[PDB]
């Protein structure tokens, strides 16, 4: 296998990324103004991810239910949703944001996922004790929400989605899922979650995938073709971006 | 169970409510002008409910049939509908408003309902002889409707909806249901009412829930997933408001 | 001489008002729940007013600036605006609501105003100390706004608008007027104020009149025709309602 | 029972109707000008019926086939369609108007039809010889049609629709039905006619009902639910009018 | 001088009119059912007139102000408007209907008016005391209006419009004109009224002419060209009908 | 059976037709300019047919495939199509126009076709040698088409469609049918051709009938009801015209 | 000067025209059926001219007034208009069709018209006595109009437009011009008529030119630029066709 056939950063993207890291970490901005100037360090690729999440969220503002992410890593998307929920929904204490991850990286891989060299147990592990920090970040956002006095509006569920997702659902019979964001990369957990969330979607719910047509991670495609079929609903892109691919339930 | 995980009033929301109550009861406004200045005392949260009811009503203006509320309490919504019916349909004597309730609170609760501390029989009980008072309120509105001379345009049906709803439908084979507003909280009566009203709905009829995705009251969701499925039709919010969740039958 | 040629309440309308008044003041609803059930006592005519204000507010949600009402009486419209502002603009602390009145009724009437038997000095006077009460009412609402910590978001200006409006404007050079609601009834103050607010309107600003084509109060029409002409912009009704008459500046 | 729960004329509506009747029959208008000033005597309620037939007619101008009314009485609607056909379709000699009736009133009633005190044999009977008069009225209209030389564009079919409708259809195999207006009030004949006309409807054909949700006449509702179901197509009102309820075949 | 170049009735139109006149005045329909069956006698030409007036009325439903007709004769249009005001605006007691006429025919004529042989003083005169009968007819309609207790909602002003229209305006300074219907036929009075009404129109008000391009009555055209110019606004027809021609002020 | 109940020419339509014919054959127009002034001799009824053909054709400009007429006679529609194909599709040599006919009138007739007097064998026959002449007419048109070097873009298929249509289809397996125009009048061949063309239609293809609801030729209706059902797709008129009736395949 | 740089018939276009002429004059079609089969002989170029006239007429269906063609020749467009008026406006006897021509060719050419070899006096002359034949053709159409009893609905005005157009307008003060079709080719008359018709156009009136940007006839352009300017209104093509160029008055 030629590693260059997989999507990877150009020398230029790496340099931009490194330079911005340096300028953030060695900034002459007074410390208490840094969080007021973050777009200085938010480059095209990452800006694009933010704008995509906003696009997805704007499509479920008239749909009841919660937002769910499978595959959280450091929580980039969860931070986005928490901010976006403040922007769009000050008066919606029921828009719960729920993140699922082992927080210890890939639990185990299936043969179908072994395409490139990063398909191994432990990949994307974040540091020990990470969830408590991420929760602390989320709580910092919620502190100034109109419904900040209501708790469990952000929830991190730690462990294998194959177990945690059905358990979460059993414990929350009130669930409707407005937006389901799949970023697991792996075939087995994707398939299992797709199956479990099905009774809690309504027509109009968004199902989104981070890696559906990526050669390095065919698992999500394989899972989709198995549980539903690629033409079960219309899979769409936000024009100009390879990801996410997303569908509107019932369409 | 942490009670703060359930939606509850902020201290400032309580304060607003309490101050407005006091300013309503101790007012330099002549008593004869109070009903000409009610918005002085109608805070955001309740104004929102009024706007929501108006929004749902406007969606059934071209749909034949009647308006039904399952779960009335003091009758806030019934009064709204009566006023709105005047605004929109002076020439429609067949737009009957029917409110079902025990008027003695929750008759009995199912296991699935006991998530929180208010899940007891008698909860939301209104005083003795309340239905007659509400009838007087409704009559007072209708007294100046264009079709005020026609009776039973507002009907209060006392008792368990498990029997009163099939009984009302039986006594009224002419029924078409334009708007079904569900506020029963409990699994059992919701399921029963859903099943009973189904043959009286047309494509375009609105079925609306007050608590579809509230952790405190999962019985409406459980009932929905049992009788119909969350994706039977597109469930929707009016953007910015946790509730009602509503669907357009047949969509 | 024929007073029936002026709009007045039918016997039934009078009946509705008195009855609902009686039912409000002698309600079995626990006193602390009354402000949660105000629609019971909100009749068609008043509901219509509320819906109209909402319709006007919605037309300026993408227009910067403040809301001004000229002629407040007990503050029916100010309460409405204050609640709607919570509904629509939790994050807009610049949307100031400004009500102008003598609060002692008509200060001095012109001959053109003297069409009916109620065009007298001091007509619509409210009790001494009223502005402080109304301010308490508005403070009560603002208590639980997202930006409740910011003061002077509701301002009552007491005096003859012929002097107080130009003074307010001179004191607030940041002013842009999104919504100007005219409810003074009288020719001279309407003329004066129409002239003064003009440099503070943008294309898209709404100017509304409560009695533009009412035989009993021709002053607003007379003022309009003299200052701008009736075809300066398109004057509109919300269909089904004799009032308000409103125009979008620049259309 | 209490008859006042049934839709009935107000004292004022009765007054309007009697006054207009007297003003028509005892008028200073020259006799040859009466038919040029009919709207003087056409009150809101009957104007509404006319505007409704017009709205229904306009929806089938792009649909091939004939117009049928079941339940003609004096022929109010037949006169309307004959005029409207002139307005919109000078060049369509195939737009046949067919009216069915006993012209001797209700032939017999089912038990479900006996809610009110008018549900007996002979009800709504028209005098002997009436059909021949009604044909005179129709012929009079057609005399000035562009296709006035083509006979049988208006047809009165006398008898019980249970027999006459299928008979008419068998004798007319070219039939397409663009508009079917149901005004029989009773259950069994509505049911029979519904089942009969089905093979002659196209998608877009209008099926309309005068009494679908009237408590006094539940037969049409019962028939509809028995034959098709209330959610077979979207049943609709023209906004602000209790009747007719109509559907677009295939929607 | 060919009279067949003027629009006149065909033999068939004449026959239809005569027959319907006979069938109306010699009807076997019970006297109390006549005004429930008037469309039996309303032929194409007149039905067309009715639908045209309805079309114009619908275009001013969101325009404040009154309806004026200049040239009333027997009042066909006034009756139409009275019914239509009921259909569309039960809650607008300010929609005054004002009809201007000598009620004794053409007061005098101009030479430009003398194209055909019906341009003589007294043409279209109605019997003595006619305004009292027409007022009785209008009062009959209003008797059952929601705002029936408000008087002078219909006004017949007798005299030459050249003086009566400016006098009406001077006495009613609250006037906005939503719909102005010119049916005077003659140049001079049309000219004078067009000039008088102008300060009372808003953008969106409708001005309609019954005979704008009629070779028999060039008066309205000459007047229009003199006062405004034919391209002052877009003059329009309702497709398929020679009259009325109308414009939306300001367009 | 009254023959006046079938559509037939009025005396005036006959007169117009006979006059135009005489004016054509006895024209002072120079012979070589006649084909530049044909609209002089094209009356309303025939102009309408042309506009209808153009309307149907415009609906299939984005649909692949050929144009078929069943029932050609002298070739009126084939000539229209040839010219229209020039107007809209100079660059489409695959838009073949195929006309089927015996060219000897009806080959037989069924009992259901025998409603009128002209339902006999050989009705609508054209002279011996006629197809060769018609072919000469079409070749003249194609001579100046952009793709006039490609042959068989117009094809006359002589014989009974019961045999020739399936034979044509077997010989042309590339066939898609964009527009199928039925003008056979008769039950049996309509039925046969309807079944045969089905596999060659796409969603969007237009099926059109010239006689669908004509009492004199109920065969096409009988065929439709038997093969597809009148509600298989929406049958449509071009407003104002009794015919064609046409449907969009798959709607 | 190269005459090839002017638009002219290709050999194939010439061949088509001559063949069709031959086939029309030696046709086996029974003489009485010729006028039922004209599209056989209507080639693309001529079909195109008909569809454009139809497109133009369709755009003035809601505009009052008459249709004028300046430059009639053999009357092709007038025939088209007569028939289209039948298709679209059976009920509009005021839609006068007025054609102006010398009927003896170009009266005299300006120097700016002498670009090609056909720019000479007498060019396009029609036989002596032609107008009576054309009128007889027009009368033939009108014979079967709904308003056929109204005369002068077609007018041929013989003479020089510089004199006849102003005379016609002076004699017809009721004139509104819905559609003005310029086909004079020459500068002087085009300028004169443009100036003359202006006071009779309304906003929406269509002004169309047959030779606006034709090198061989620059006279219409020169006149447009002198009288109004090319950017007075938006000049438009029906896409695909070099002519007509048309504008919508007031756009
Ligand atoms: N079976 C499973 N259960 C829980 N998490 C899983 C899982 N399989 C994969 N994951 C998680 O999916 C994540 C993929 S990385 C996703 C986050 C993304 N990089 C962002 O910044 O937005 C990893 O953290 C991995 O631990
Ligand atoms: N089985 C049952 N039959 C009748 N009423 C029931 C019921 N189960 C619950 N309810 C009622 O549901 C109500 C919920 S409180 C909802 C009312 C609220 N004020 C509003 O505006 O709609 C209670 O009053 C309770 O008595
Ligand atoms: N010149 C002036 N200066 C200040 N207030 C004036 C004024 N002229 C009239 N007003 C006020 O205009 C008011 C009219 S009543 C307004 C009613 C109120 N907006 C409601 O919704 O109920 C009176 O209070 C009167 O005092
Ligand atoms: N079985 C049946 N067969 C024929 N006519 C019937 C019938 N049952 C009821 N009807 C007729 O239905 C009619 C209802 S009254 C219809 C009123 C009329 N359409 C209008 O617009 O005014 C009666 O005339 C009655 O004779
Ligand atoms: N100067 C004037 N003052 C008042 N009326 C005038 C007038 N000049 C003409 N008229 C009136 O214009 C009328 C024209 S006939 C109007 C008919 C009526 N609009 C209908 O719908 O049937 C006549 O009644 C005539 O009296
Ligand atoms: N079974 C059959 N097979 C082939 N042609 C048939 C047929 N039945 C009827 N036809 C033909 O259908 C034609 C009907 S006349 C249709 C032609 C019309 N002028 C037009 O513009 O299209 C006749 O020519 C007849 O010969
Ligand atoms: N000054 C003038 N007065 C009257 N007619 C004129 C004219 N100048 C040119 N014409 C006429 O304009 C015509 C141009 S040919 C017109 C062709 C025609 N419109 C068609 O559709 O076939 C000629 O007949 C010519 O006589």
From TrEMBL, chains A, B, C, D, E, F, G:
L-glutamate 2 binds at residues 210-211, 216-217. S-adenosyl-L-homocysteine 1 binds at residues 73, 76, 101, 160-161. S-adenosyl-L-homocysteine 2 binds at residues 76, 101, 160-161. InterPro entries: SAM-dependent_MTases_sf, TylF_MeTrfase. L-glutamate 1 binds at residues 183, 210-211, 217. This is CalS11. Residues 1-11 have a biased composition (Basic and acidic residues). GO terms for molecular function: O-methyltransferase activity. Residues 1-16 are annotated as: Disordered. PANTHER family: MACROCIN O-METHYLTRANSFERASE. The lineage of its organism: Bacteria, Bacillati, Actinomycetota, Actinomycetes, Micromonosporales. It holds the Pfam family Methyltransf_24. It comes from the Bacteria.
